[PDB]
Symmetry: C3
Subunit: 243 residues, 3 copies
Amino acid sequence: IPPIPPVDFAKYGEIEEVPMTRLMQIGATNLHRSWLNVPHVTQFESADITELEAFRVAQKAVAKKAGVKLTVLPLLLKACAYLLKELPDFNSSLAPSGQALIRKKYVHIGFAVDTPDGLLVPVIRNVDQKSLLQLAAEAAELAEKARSKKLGADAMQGACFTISSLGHIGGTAFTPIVNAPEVAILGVSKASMQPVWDGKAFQPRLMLPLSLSYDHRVINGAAAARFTKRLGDLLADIRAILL
Amino acid sequence: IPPIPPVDFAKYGEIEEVPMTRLMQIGATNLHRSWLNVPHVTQFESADITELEAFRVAQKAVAKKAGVKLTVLPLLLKACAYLLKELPDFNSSLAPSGQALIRKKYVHIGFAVDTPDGLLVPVIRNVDQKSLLQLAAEAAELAEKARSKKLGADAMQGACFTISSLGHIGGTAFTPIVNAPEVAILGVSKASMQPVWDGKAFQPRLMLPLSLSYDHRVINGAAAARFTKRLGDLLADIRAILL
Amino acid sequence: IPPIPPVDFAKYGEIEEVPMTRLMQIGATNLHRSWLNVPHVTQFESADITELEAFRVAQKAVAKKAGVKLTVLPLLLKACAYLLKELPDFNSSLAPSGQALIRKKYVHIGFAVDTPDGLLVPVIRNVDQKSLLQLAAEAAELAEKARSKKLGADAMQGACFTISSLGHIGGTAFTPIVNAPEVAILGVSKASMQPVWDGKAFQPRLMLPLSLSYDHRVINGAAAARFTKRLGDLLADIRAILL
Ligand SMILES: NC(=O)CCCC[C@@H](S)CCS
Ligand SMILES: NC(=O)CCCC[C@@H](S)CCS
Ligand SMILES: NC(=O)CCCC[C@@H](S)CCS
């Protein structure tokens, strides 16, 4: 690929060189390796989380007793685990022969933690088997270890899918990058109150923005519109996971 | 381009290998070839289809008599054909010398059909010359042949532009991939009722999401904002095609 | 990277070859060089410009006296200059050793002008030091020289960031391409009146769409959600720049 020409930046004004941590360097290399290997498409969708929210907030007692804090990440993780099992091509990877997909029969999911040294993406194993408070507890442990450079490579491995949540900072949507060899990553941005047509008038409903990027060689356009559709349906009534 | 390292996926749990149809393999190869050749930009726009819809639904009698079913795809195809003629750089391809564009004086348009064996994109020729019921009939023939593996390579050739409609499944917008050597592809997602400001109050209007990806080497940012603008104008009052 | 196969386009109908200006050729080459070097992410956000607008329009007298026309571009430029100083990683470039960032202590910003010969991106130097009418005057000079092929290479150099505004043509959002070796570009599309929840009811507020693309090797997902957040905050009350 042609390089970018060097520029004497100091011709235009004062410059200063600060260097990158090896963590940044790693991160930089893996992203570019994904960018060039994966033909990327992003599917956007909004889910009605008005009831999910009200539930989150009512179980604040139970979660405080249990020592965890229930955010939207456990709810996101449980629903994606259920869907990674309904729609298995999302839970798979392209075999290196380019002629097969390796369907994984396990559901471990990673999630992005941005630490000062760089991006780390700790993996929770067997998301399909743990409960909302279990996942809430674990998510939090892994994140603190991640910030404290006390997370060990063991825990950064063999994930099937990634959730990257910027909802706590803001933004309307983004186009995340597939963390190859995985085939899809779900970006979650900030919830807003929004008018939604109820057949007769507009009701305010709390809407969560979802931005699913995928490896188009393995997932086609309709498979992906269907994944974000099912997920917005699950998040609107999480009781369907009981079914 | 550096490869992705192989991972022994079975270290993390049970895996299973299912293989790809040659159709998937083809599809995979062409997408990646586009991804690396075309610097991609996506322009988003929403069109007011409230009147187009009401028309669609009133001609249901006529279409049933004629044996076709009138969906939004014939209306999309007619308007894009008209615009591919108004704005010709969208109807062209970059000559392989990299120093010229081959402007095509014909308008054949392909459309994406997702079949079980993979993605197929049958082409309707001379869209500019056929009527809404003609295109409705033809769209449907080609799609059934496509699902039935009875579509022949003849019919997958020399298109100028592509429409990829996921509207029937859902989603808010997506970033489709230019089907090189074409220079643009129009993605259409699900229509929603939306409040639209009428200078004094918000009216509910049925809004169709449009996501136009283009080859930025041939189309610049303003040419593309102008194409989606004209198209939202045409779809708001399709009678302008008579002009 | 594999090439795209040549197609005898004339098998399908009449074609015509028109050639590209060297300006297009240049533009084409630089875009593709960016596309393959920069792993791109786009962050979307909307800013409430209702008060900024009303201000713009009240200073129409002053601007007419001063011979300039105050559009949104000076307001965009002043706020980005302030932020390129608050959040310095946006004002930097990746050193060619891949192991360092060159932080630039200057703020010159380029902006995209689409001329008939191709795209040109004149640079305003030391945006941080000039006032709204200064920048309004200058923006306009550079743009006319650009359209008149009277802009000289001097003026197309050593920018730190780019603003690409298609707001005057239309569109809802787009994904612009980082103009490498810069690390981010802000796309601005068309403002619309929109219902915004005020805790009790929806108020109409004039909303400006912002689409920030960045080089993910240098800027992480949260740094970028924070830049578009601060910018929507600055544009909502530009007096915070006085602080
Ligand atoms: N851990 C890494 O080194 C790179 C992670 C890349 C994949 C995702 S988090 C990109 C999100 S925009
Ligand atoms: N027919 C193919 O083999 C690939 C088609 C690629 C172009 C479009 S449909 C991608 C849409 S996201
Ligand atoms: N001046 C050039 O030759 C290319 C500019 C590329 C960067 C930006 S303007 C792309 C915007 S979509």
